[PDB]
Amino acid sequence: MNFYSAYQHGFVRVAACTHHTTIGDPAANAASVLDMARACHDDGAALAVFPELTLSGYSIEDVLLQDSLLDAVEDALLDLVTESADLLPVLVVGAPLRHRHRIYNTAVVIHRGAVLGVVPKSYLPTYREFYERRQMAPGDGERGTIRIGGADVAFGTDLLFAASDLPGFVLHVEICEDMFVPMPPSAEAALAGATVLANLSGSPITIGRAEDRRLLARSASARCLAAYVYAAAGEGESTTDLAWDGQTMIWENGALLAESERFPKGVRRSVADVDTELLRSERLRMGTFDDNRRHHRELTESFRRIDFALDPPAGDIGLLREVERFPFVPADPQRLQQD
Amino acid sequence: MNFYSAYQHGFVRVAACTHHTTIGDPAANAASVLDMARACHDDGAALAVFPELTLSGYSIEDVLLQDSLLDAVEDALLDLVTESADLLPVLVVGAPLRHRHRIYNTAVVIHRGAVLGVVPKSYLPTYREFYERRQMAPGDGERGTIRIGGADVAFGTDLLFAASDLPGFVLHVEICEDMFVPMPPSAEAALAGATVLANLSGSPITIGRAEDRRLLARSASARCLAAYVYAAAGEGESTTDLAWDGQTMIWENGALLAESERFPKGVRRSVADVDTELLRSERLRMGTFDDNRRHHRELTESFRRIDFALDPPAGDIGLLREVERFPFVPADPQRLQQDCYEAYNIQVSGLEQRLRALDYPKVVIGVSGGLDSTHALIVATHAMDREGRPRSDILAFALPGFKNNAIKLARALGVTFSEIDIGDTARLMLHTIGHVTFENVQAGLRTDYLFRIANQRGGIVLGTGDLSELALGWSTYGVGDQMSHYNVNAGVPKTLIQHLIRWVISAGEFGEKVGEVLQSVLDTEISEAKVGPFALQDFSLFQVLRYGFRPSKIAFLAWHAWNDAERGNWPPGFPKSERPSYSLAEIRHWLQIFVQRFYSFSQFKRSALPNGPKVSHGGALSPRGDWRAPSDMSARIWLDQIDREVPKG
Amino acid sequence: MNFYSAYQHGFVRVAACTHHTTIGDPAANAASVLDMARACHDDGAALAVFPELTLSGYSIEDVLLQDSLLDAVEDALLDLVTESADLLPVLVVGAPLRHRHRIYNTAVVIHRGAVLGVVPKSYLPTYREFYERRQMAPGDGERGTIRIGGADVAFGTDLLFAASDLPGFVLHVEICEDMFVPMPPSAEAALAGATVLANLSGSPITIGRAEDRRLLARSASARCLAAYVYAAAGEGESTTDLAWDGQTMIWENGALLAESERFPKGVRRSVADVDTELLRSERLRMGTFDDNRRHHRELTESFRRIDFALDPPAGDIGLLREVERFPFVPADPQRLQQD
Ligand SMILES: NC(=O)c1ccc[n+]([C@@H]2O[C@H](COP(=O)([O-])OP(=O)(O)OC[C@H]3O[C@@H](n4cnc5c(N)ncnc54)[C@H](O)[C@@H]3O)[C@@H](O)[C@H]2O)c1
């Protein structure tokens, strides 16, 4: 055995990335994504989540409907997919994609030269500063496949991406607003077996919103005994009516593993080692969790499980995790006072 | 790339054929079909639809039940399929076919040597002159397969034929009466993804029936955001009790692409290039269409999708499509009169409501003798007339800086006229900031003065900038002509403005003296040096605003409409001296200027836009309505698309 | 018998009205409605259709979400219902109404002192100049009841209002965009038994749109062997970004019975006598129509049928219908040339 290998001890290294948006320029966005993903690769990450609508920019409104923009997004996506043949992590990249009659607000799950799945956002906010239903169709209840670069790949809200050589790591993906409704796709996903829940977010920033995002990502990670990996848009998005803060964060069962500088100059990543055994153990013990699943048996057995082989690095890559010396004695004085 | 290829620009060429019927003689019918299909092939067509029951004749009644007839039909169908190995288009041929217990009234979808599917008619009229249920069984709800020439092929109402190498082209087929019932198979098919709807018809002709066919084919194509391809039986059908007119027609989203001579001597075809990108775009935009699909999810997910490779011709095969030069200005005089009547009334009623709401302020307007302000002054006047307001509450101003039409118009209409020389204020202002800035100081001070007069005199300032100027950011933003309290011209493209003024003259409502001045404004007035000819920019604007077509597609369309001044039609009022034709090199040139100005530079000017009514179905440019876009975006990708896809000349 | 009575010969008199909109002032709208409805009464009409969102104005955007606006809408509706005790016709009045979580874009079907039903618009355009999904919820698939003035009344897209003493008159209601989608609620309603199809429209006017409205109302009336009664908004709607034309029209089996002045100064009505026997006869003969219904048996048997007694006038009220002398020889020279 290799005793100093985080992977050999049931950790999976995950990254939430905020790239440099160049609105309406998918080649540029892809290039920023590719450069960030190569960093993640170098870090031995298994997973790299990007902001909502990465390849186009979230904030471009009716420019999303322009043939040239949609065409350029496809072209760029196929280049990423080809570049990914050499990248270790699963990439989750946002893209407006044509399917059937409309464009869907999707997250493309990319791995080692192939698209594993395409996941459409389920709930499209059309209120206050949000106009998503104007340009894009709702994903809830879409199944089937979508044709991307001459292959048919699973399409829908019901997908799970399971590492065949790392069974603690089962990915589900949702998008921004999805985690804000009473019954988020990710909650059914966790009952079905998802352990790492990704969220690609656009999320223009307002007073108090960062708290809202935390409240909902944290509670989700706790109620679903899961890692929650979250990435919002930042510099480059249009400031015609909104500002953007680039927040990224990674939660695990209610605990913050990592977050990044708000309003950064330049791109930022949150990278952390998620303990899949911790999630495994919590779930093994909390039988009411499996009880919830059995109660929603129909909902939860209908997930399609797409397999991939991660083949993570076997050597010493450190441990990107804060392990406290005294599990019973919190180092933070305010927390210790409370206990 | 091949830039002159209709197929490379998302067109699919379709044909509706009416052959020579020889009743009870399938070999003869197939021979007519084969000969017509070879023509369609030579034309590069992707699809050729024939009349109901092609192989037998629709009108043979109980002869449909004779073994020898049914046997001959099969033999002929198998020859067609064999001949089709060498034919480009998908053939849709009618045939009475045995399945299970009965004969179905079917359409056989044939392609490159194989049967792709067999589609039975759903609803069999048995009333009036129709006796179909006597011989044939209903198809609604039949699924499974049917055995045709030793192969099992899909059979049923639920089929879609999708071109794998041409995704804009997804065929659904129905038969005659099918499109006449409240809930036609074709409507479910469109929601499932069908973009081209074929109809094989028998349809004996009677007074008023051709209108009925039109009504229903046209409305289907419009309601289903689709092409509708229709072919009825003609010469050769029995005239025992009925006559036949051979009508063929092709519709696209409500518009007639093509139709053929009724009661022809001989066979006739309608052939047209359908714009699959147009349908794509309409559907991308009308979300309620996908909403309808989701509501009928069960109905629409159950379609079976049969794939085929069309492999259409890559070369220049022309463009069988009427591309009008002025998307905003219809060449047909009747249609143009109608649009003008509507534009005008929209403008007026928009302004009447603002005035009513403000308890009838004075209307302040800068009149320079140019087309836009002339027209706005007229609109203002009419609005005031309709609301029983004295024309003297209109305050027209000439604002000379560093024309006679303006004072002549104002005196003739009898509004309140006044001159204010802004030059001194401008000299003062230029000196004070220590001096585009020079043009802008004047343009701004005009607006500044008008606004202040409006405060002073209890008015609102009427904007006069037109849509084409909004599109290109050809205005002075903020303090300048971009700004006003209400803009009646905001929705009207420049190419339409001259026709509204004529329309106003021709109606004659304002009297002979006013008409003379208006005529003079036209004669006199008719910056395009820097922003290009508005005919071209209004063309690109319509494509971008309505469909979001890529630059190369816009270039292709514009070149087909504009490259030859002798081809196509000109709206009324273009003396043959003002009938230019444009080269590709020019069209390319102005398009680069257009995408850069439209997508990148100009949006901030539209972002803070005063109120005013949408006019055109092509769209308007209100950031509160039709056009929501970033004020801080580059146009690199459109510029790059032109570099890559549009030849230099 | 009374031989000169249009009603005794199977006619039902219907009105499509365009009122004076006062945006954000329900009391004022109701007052206009009340006054037009009294006219219809005097004309012996059985039915009076008004424009989309009559009681609030269609064009008021987020003002639709203001409590005071919604409260005033309810008060005004209840006054109408009370005034309707004395009115002969069934009134179909537009109103933004609270139900469950949202406001629905509804048509309230009122008759002789009671609300027969409330019908929500099914398809809410959110594209180009339309933003309906921002303020209002889709009605497709809503059923049940809604509580209006202390009574529970049928709510949903599936309703038929059938005159018990006049069986040729079975009303279905849809709203604007409803008639523009491939499978309109009205088409199922006709297969289920509806003979008179109402449409309340807002429909800001643009070049060519009046044609579009005609194309779609005319084809529907022909394909559904029905009368189609249509009323659009006019003077008074906001001209912040749009104009309005007040078009009203009444179709019967593809033929124009009546239409009103476009861009009128003041209110206008189309009033016409619809021949229910003509519709009856066409349907009796075109068996493929009944075939279509059977094929959509599940769709069509699920309609709820609300009964009311019209008790129309028995006397001579003329005949608001153009009866040509030569059924075989059209009076219009252009049409006659064609025949
Ligand atoms: N026929 C007409 O309608 C008309 C009238 C006046 C001027 N013009 C033409 O157009 C010109 C007007 O010049 P212009 O357009 O440079 O003047 P402008 O002042 O309207 O535009 C530039 C101004 O806005 C700022 N700006 C540019 N982009 C911005 C953005 N994205 N966001 C916020 N602010 C931004 C610039 O820094 C500058 O202050 C004239 O020189 C003339 O040739 C035409």
Ligand SMILES: Nc1ncnc2c1ncn2[C@@H]1O[C@H](COP(=O)(O)O)[C@@H](O)[C@H]1O
């Ligand atoms: N000389 C002028 N006198 C009065 N108004 C003017 C004058 N020049 C421009 N305007 C106003 O400003 C608008 C913009 O015109 P322009 O900048 O010349 O294209 C005109 O339509 C008028 O409303």
Ligand SMILES: N[C@@H](CCC(=O)O)C(=O)O
């Ligand atoms: N539903 C949230 C959106 C928060 C987000 O998208 O990040 C709001 O409008 O406040």
Ligand SMILES: N[C@@H](CCC(=O)O)C(=O)O
């Ligand atoms: N049912 C239609 C059929 C028309 C046709 O076949 O063209 C009619 O009777 O008019």
Ligand SMILES: N[C@@H](CCC(=O)O)C(=O)O
């Ligand atoms: N779907 C139509 C709507 C027409 C109407 O609502 O009257 C459009 O293009 O805007």
